[PDB]
Amino acid sequence: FVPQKEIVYNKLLPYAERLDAESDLQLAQIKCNLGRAVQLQELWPGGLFWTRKLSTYIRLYGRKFSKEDHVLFIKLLYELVSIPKLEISMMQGFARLLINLLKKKELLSRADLELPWRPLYDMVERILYSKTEHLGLNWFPNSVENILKTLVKSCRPYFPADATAEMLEEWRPLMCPFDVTMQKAITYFEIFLPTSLPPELHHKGFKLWFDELIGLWVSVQNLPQWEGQLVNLFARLATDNIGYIDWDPYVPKIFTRILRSLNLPVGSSQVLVPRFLTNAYDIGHAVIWITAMMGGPSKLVQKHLAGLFNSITSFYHPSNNGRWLNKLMKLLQRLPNSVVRRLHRERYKKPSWLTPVPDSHKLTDQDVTDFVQCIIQPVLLAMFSKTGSLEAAQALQNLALMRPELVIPPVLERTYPALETLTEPHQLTATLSCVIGVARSLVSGGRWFPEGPTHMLPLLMRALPGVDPNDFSKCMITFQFIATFSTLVPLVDCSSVLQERNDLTEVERELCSATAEFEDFVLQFMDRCFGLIESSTLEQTREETETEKMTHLESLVELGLSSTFSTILTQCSKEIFMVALQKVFNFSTSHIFETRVAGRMVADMCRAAVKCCPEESLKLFVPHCCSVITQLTMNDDVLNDEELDKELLWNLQLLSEITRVDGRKLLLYREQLVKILQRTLHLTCKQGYTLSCNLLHHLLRSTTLIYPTEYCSVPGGFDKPPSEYFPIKDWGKPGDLWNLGIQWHVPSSEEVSFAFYLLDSFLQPELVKLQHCGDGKLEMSRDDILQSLTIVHNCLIGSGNLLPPLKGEPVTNLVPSMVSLEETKLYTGLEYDLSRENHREVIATVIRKLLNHILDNSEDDTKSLFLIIKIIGDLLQFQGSHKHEFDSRWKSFNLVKKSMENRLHGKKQHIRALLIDRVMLQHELRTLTVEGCEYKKIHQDMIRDLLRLSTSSYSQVRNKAQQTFFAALGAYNFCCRDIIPLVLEFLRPDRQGVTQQQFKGALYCLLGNHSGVCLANLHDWDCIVQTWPAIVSSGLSQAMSLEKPSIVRLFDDLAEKIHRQYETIGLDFTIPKSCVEIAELLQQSKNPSINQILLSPEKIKEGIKRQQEKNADALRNYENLVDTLLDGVEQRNLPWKFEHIGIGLLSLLLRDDRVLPLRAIRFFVENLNHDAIVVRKMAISAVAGILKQLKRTHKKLTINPCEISGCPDRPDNHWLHYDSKTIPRTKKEWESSCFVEKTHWGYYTWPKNMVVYAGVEEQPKLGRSREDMTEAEQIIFDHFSDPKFVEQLITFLSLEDRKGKDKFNPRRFCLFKGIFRNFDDAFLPVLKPHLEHLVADSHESTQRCVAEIIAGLIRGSKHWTFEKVEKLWELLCPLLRTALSNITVETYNDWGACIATSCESRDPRKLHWLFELLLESPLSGEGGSFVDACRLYVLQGGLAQQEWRVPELLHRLLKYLEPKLTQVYKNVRERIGSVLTYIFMIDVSLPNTTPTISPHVPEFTARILEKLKPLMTQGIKLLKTILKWLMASAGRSFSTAVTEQLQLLPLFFKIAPVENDNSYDELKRDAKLCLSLMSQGLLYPHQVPLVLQVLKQTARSSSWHARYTVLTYLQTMVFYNLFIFLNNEDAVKDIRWLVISLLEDEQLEVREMAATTLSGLLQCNFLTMDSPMQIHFEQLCKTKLPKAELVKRHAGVLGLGACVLSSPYDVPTWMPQLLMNLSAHLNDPQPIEMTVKKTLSNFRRTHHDNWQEHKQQFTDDQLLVLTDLLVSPCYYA
């Protein structure tokens, strides 16, 4: 038996008694056939048909199986995605299911399930880091990167406990921080490392790697691509292991980089902008990482949040918007969203095997109060931003779940002045948006904020002018405002409870007296909405046309008034209803509205009046409307007409859109509705019958659908028990899911026999007229058929719940299967006895005769053909609900649910009006979940009749028919195999008469033009072997008008959809022997498994035999697809545009598991010399992949690195010396040298198996001829030996594809890499002239051509014998010396990526000929100076790519440059500075490292100071190389400030100018923006005594330029390091000394920057405004002036003014005092007089935003001082 693990919302559903017998029968059919599909070696029909059906079963019944059945499903799905080398598209199909079984962690414990991880790594590395799939060998899906990560994430908490040191042993040797192989490891660490381990396993957890990898993270100070992965790792480590990390030693380093990742402009020049900060921290991962730190006993992370926001409050102000605001609004959206989820995780979540937080690490009531109080001031400034109020109201909702008494009064103090202002209208858009998130916490008066619903009704009454027909932004947010209040509070009078009753409290009796205005709200809501309608009627201005479409902005106001009025009028007492029903009736019947805009809009407002009480409302509408239709239609002969009377034509829509109340209470009016349908449905006016068809439609909709009738917040309703319960208690009703009290409308036999009586009196008389017209015996008009089809369409679409689909079962051509392919059946509650009529089959036979008559006898009747598409679109796939209306109510539910949800305590607070709709969304999901559908013989005919309409004469008819055609291809099982042979019949050359509409209509059938089914690019060989040749066979002969421009865009879209969507198809579906799990799932499940067969004696041999036949035909159809394309591209009289598609389909077939067939190897090699540049650009990309296929598999062996190097920790070990190329380079005995090819090996640690290549000649033989050769696949040898082929190949490659966009092609490189690797310079004597001719040419086309061949020689010379290596460089070392001599402007990026490419993954031993040539003379300039710079830039990329493997050549190049760097030019200085950052990149100071052999920054900079000692003319020449180096080592080094470089700062301050203008020298201009890059760089917290010693020394007394720039250094250096300094509390006393002691400067320009610095430090709360600060200024202002004393008195006026400018948007308690005595220095002398005039005029500028709130902090005696005061500039005097 099954104890269900987790189910759904189906208990409530009305047919809940039948959801156990139907669910368990499908689950038993899952266990049978999914086990039998795997065990009978079948994945093409059957492995996917029951993976989809379990994917359907999870999305329909929750889990609803047992724990033993849940580990059978996981361990079957896991072993299928971990098959070695599957088909990768079906690997995702098993993947998304296997994510769904595992994403709910609480369902399966750790002791109940375990999964290995190395099957995931071979799965990931083949799909994510494939060594193919850039040469054209594999073709992956587009979604493969994120599905595999979210699968490992779902499999990660079930990895075994001994399998993370097993995981820290494999990629820990990849952590050399210089190669690209480190972010290989760090992305594996973020994905694979187990962090959600139980607390008895942390020693086998993060403690193996935490201090090893947080110590790496704190030591970088660049921003690599892998630093953003560790913040995604450490966040996930933090959020699971709360209370087991001590983040306190690392918390100032964490918040200083979250601040730094905001990238805030600070300093009034503020940037020599580092472009390395493109990569940064995803703050959405940082919010996860702050939130998991807060609950500690020492509240240390809390004040770093208060230090964070208070430093950035001025950026949330709505005047200060900029680039930073998108990260900064996103920070407010997520931190209250995440603190609440942590509070739900520790207060209301049920326990599971996931470890809870400890009691010591849990958020206290103080801790969440102090979180709101440090975020409330930035969220209220975000409320009024220019970018909207969406991010603030989502923040303000989640803050209101925690502390309502602290967050709701600061909002409603700004809301009441916003609803009555008539000036600053933006608040009403933004304050109302924020009360809607507040609304759940506002109407619910808790034990802290009980005054909430006192503000309910006055905000609700003052919002009534918001419904105005002038704004629509106010009107939508007003309709959203009142509907979100009038679904919380019942609108009931409370006066009979206002008598003697002791239940009312002080606040609750204040509510009941205010409920006298509930009727006055609803009636004034209507008188405001009637003017909203009657002033929005449609004006017919243009006399020719008729605007019939309600626009999108007006369709929202219909639905916005259909929502916001039906929610008032449901949440409403019956006494207030019926006095408001008459206001609707006395409006909508005394007027005559235009039926287009105001017709849909009045009748929807009446539709709301009927759906709330259908008895009392239908007593007066349908007697009124039917008595006036029969008066105004059947009196005269208005059956035949041209235009109806606008009142008759009104009262149909007033009746049609009103008769869709609950269909039980329409049986009273049977003999009135049928009477008008028998009189106005057969009219002549094209709007007259469509309003009558909408009447017939909605009557059938109301009498066969299951839907809820009421949507009230209380299940009894607000009307049926008056005064039995007190209504003002259920205002904050949480609306429980159990005992919901939902009321349904299941169709009775009275409502069903009437549903067929309308169908037996209007469908059948409209079907016999269509029958005799399609037979030739009635001959109706063109509009008479059009009128009759609407009756057939509105009876089908509208009563389709009663009509069974089809019968007939087409077989014998589809896919045969060994297992069941039965269609699923879901009882959506109705029987539909299926004995009497079956009306759906009759319509399908009338149409196939009617459509056969119309397409032959009248091909021009378009509007009849549009209806036939609408009926076949509903004869096939229409049960009771619509496939698009469900998707728009699914989105409208998540728009309403996610808006008003109590995230603090779980599912128990969703309101009843949401939950009733979601149960209806569960019924409507079951009405559309037709997963399996058997392709029957009627479905073989109805789609082929759509295929005639998809190819017909008119493009309006073809476009509508193809969309039904494509939707009908996705529904039925194996239809696409039936219809490809039928749709390609319009594309054959041999066809006699095929029109151009016939032709291109069939190519819009192939080009799917949607997201559902691409019919030319299916994922099967039996379909692709027909569609791809037929595209290339078209063209050469067809009726293919290639001169029409639309058909050329069609083939360019049909070819560009194939290359975008194609994904490589498997050839071997060999299910491995490790699927005993399938036998363990078929057998012995038995708890739901009612399937007693359990047999497979020799059917498993038949399944193996049919699989090997599938494996044979998939191999056969592949090699037939190659032959049919080559017979179509080498076809005579093709157009050119059809062979580029034909080569384009051959480039996708080049496979890795196979070798391409012989005629295609001959093809792509011979098409390397093609005249079309597009073809031979593809032949380069294909022959490079052929040479990968023909690779000859070198042998390997394993090195113990203790055996070599003589003896047995992160860099440059003692047992690592053989990897470093200095002296012992191989000259004669080249073998026995242990060449380690790739760079990163052996840096950090050594792997378990360090693997190098073999010795001499154990690799395969190199020099060979055609005798010992594969005699079928090296015809490529025959072409590169022919000198006519080579001389034409060298000639085509030296063309110019473009002059600007012409770079070193990395795909011509892989062409020549695969040549000289595979053939071992058998072609190099045939390329003797064509290498020596191209180097001696001035053209950049040939220098680029030769460079791909040069680097392809070098990286092809990996496995060459020592004879061939020396014979290579004997002609190659003079060849590069020629090329490096004649290097040009358009060539040094080619050579800069030529020999920097050739040093990629080679040992520095094996290429010393470069490193003796490239380091020979880079700056000994034989010709020019730009040549010497380009000769040095190519040296840079080669030495950087062999990063740590060489200490020696870095010294030999540093020893070369250390005399030369003084006497060079600027283009060489910009290279030497770019080279010296790679000479010193190895000096890293990483946490467990060793001082490397590679040259040191401290050993070099001490020599630089020895040469700059006369400065502290030839030293100023040396600064232009040091400054250009310190510009390059800004973010391009692993430690941005070595302490010997820090005293280069006082030499830079006296040079860097003040104004920073373009008129200064290059020494000055490069010294100013070198200080900007060092201040904006980080620093370790043991450098705060070291840099502050420098800046106190530099600003002590040197020169006023240096005192100025120390201040502008500080302001953008204690901000980007703001929490390093605030941890070292001795440093903030030294900043406060230096800034204040430099207000006393002898230079005025220094001291005003000292006050600008101090004003910002006070503003970011780096310096608290203590009392001895103000005593130091207030006892400095009162200073006598006898005539040094002037500068002494001024510095107090700077100091008072610095405090004034420090709070620009608030007036604190200290603020009015130090404005009054600040204003007393206004008649002071002139240096003081400017400053007081600058400070007060800047005060008044920033304080006119909300000065009415600022003036209350002033006395009335002090307002007369500040208002009447002169601070005006010179041009007012």
Ligand SMILES: O=P(O)(O)O[C@H]1[C@H](OP(=O)(O)O)[C@@H](OP(=O)(O)O)[C@H](OP(=O)(O)OP(=O)(O)O)[C@H](OP(=O)(O)OP(=O)(O)O)[C@@H]1OP(=O)(O)O
């Ligand atoms: O069916 P939908 O629309 O796709 O949405 C499902 C979600 O998708 P899924 O069912 O897995 O496909 C699933 O969320 P995730 O698995 O992704 O986390 C459920 O979460 P869960 O219940 O496990 O988690 P908890 O209860 O929130 O802790 C439900 O989310 P809540 O409302 O928060 O959950 P409640 O249903 O209210 O209990 C939600 O049910 P609704 O239909 O009402 O939106």
Ligand SMILES: O=P(O)(O)O[C@H]1[C@H](OP(=O)(O)O)[C@@H](OP(=O)(O)O)[C@H](OP(=O)(O)O)[C@@H](OP(=O)(O)O)[C@H]1OP(=O)(O)O
């Ligand atoms: O010398 P490289 O240009 O750096 O290329 C090598 C080379 O691949 P090619 O056959 O394309 O030249 C290796 O092949 P072998 O010498 O071992 O025959 C291959 O090794 P595998 O075939 O075992 O994959 C290795 O790949 P890897 O670094 O994953 O070991 C790959 O290096 P790249 O992937 O960086 O190109």
